[PDB]
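4F2 cell-surface antigen heavy chain (Mus musculus), 422 aa
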Amino acid sequence: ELPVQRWWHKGALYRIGDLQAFVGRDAGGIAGLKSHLEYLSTLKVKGLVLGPIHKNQKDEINETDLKQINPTLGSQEDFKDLLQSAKKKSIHIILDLTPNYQGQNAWFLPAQADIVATKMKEALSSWLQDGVDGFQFRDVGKLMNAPLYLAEWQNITKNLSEDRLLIAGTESSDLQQIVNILESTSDLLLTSSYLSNSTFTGERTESLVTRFLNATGSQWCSWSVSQAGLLADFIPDHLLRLYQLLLFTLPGTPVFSYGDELGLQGALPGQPAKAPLMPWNESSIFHIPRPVSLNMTVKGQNEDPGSLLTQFRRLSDLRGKERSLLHGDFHALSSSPDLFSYIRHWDQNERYLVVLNFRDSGRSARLGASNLPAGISLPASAKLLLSTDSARQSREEDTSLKLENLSLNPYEGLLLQFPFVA
Ligand SMILES: [Cl-]
């Protein structure tokens, strides 16, 4: 019996930690973000996770004001105007209130926790009256009594409306710490390093995903590779296309950071640790932290049928409109050792079969469905909607493949579709 579907069930979240770096040098952070809403609408993302953007004098709790925007970025009025323009595109806005975000310990000192908590309660009220759709809180492993504070902040948020969302982020990849936070709260999303603490094999990927769902009784969750960092900084280069397919087709809300749709990478370890500039085009002004070529830029990837940006737009469109991906069940198939394969299914809608080859060579799928719920078995063939191999994509798209003899090319991911049979 299906719960009411809230705005975050309908597709991806998109994090913008450093508004000025996202926007560039031509405008101030809040106004400038407003001019990119049309680009963000083309990605079909359902929400933006912003900031933090508040006043925070490093490690000085009494020169930190969670209710005031940093004036370099804009005014309260600019913010309110941003929220209204986003709402005309059906894009919701989450605010990151991590308090000491400019210092080393982002939650101030342990001794200071009750002062933080008093400040935070006042801030949640003020921001919820200004029209935000919810809140994000990062590095929650550095927050004392995190489960208790998160529960309390959740209750204040939900008290106004169940359409308000809370997101927590951790540096941890440890399943037992992750489960402990989730048990303390209800319908909280928790982002983490869980999916990027990996050997990046077929078997390890299967094992990570199935153990997490089993440990949480398959409740609604987020899927991410970090609480903040870029996908191309956490995941091997050969797997960027494959991991995009995975995050879009697992059951739950996928969460990305700005630039993930391009394969952007962040600062190198000799450079200052600063968020990278979003490379709108190949102009010099965008060349921090690395020089960028046309093919690493929004302008370049926008007309390329082979680009990561083109695959993001395609998958995001399908995620927002097909019921089996909106809120379908998940079943893991058995497959050869280098593969992970699974299906998504709702009622009598089109089913989806995902097959992912984690090896640099041709592999037989050997798909098995030995244990499968009444109502669903595998067909003999299925239609190919998408391959990560853009060569095959230009000449086999919308064609049909026999499942029993399915073969994958090196590092290939497949999205296949099959119908309900009466
Ligand atoms: Cl943490």
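The chain is about 30% helix and 20% strand. The two ends are 22 Å apart (CA to CA). ok done for today
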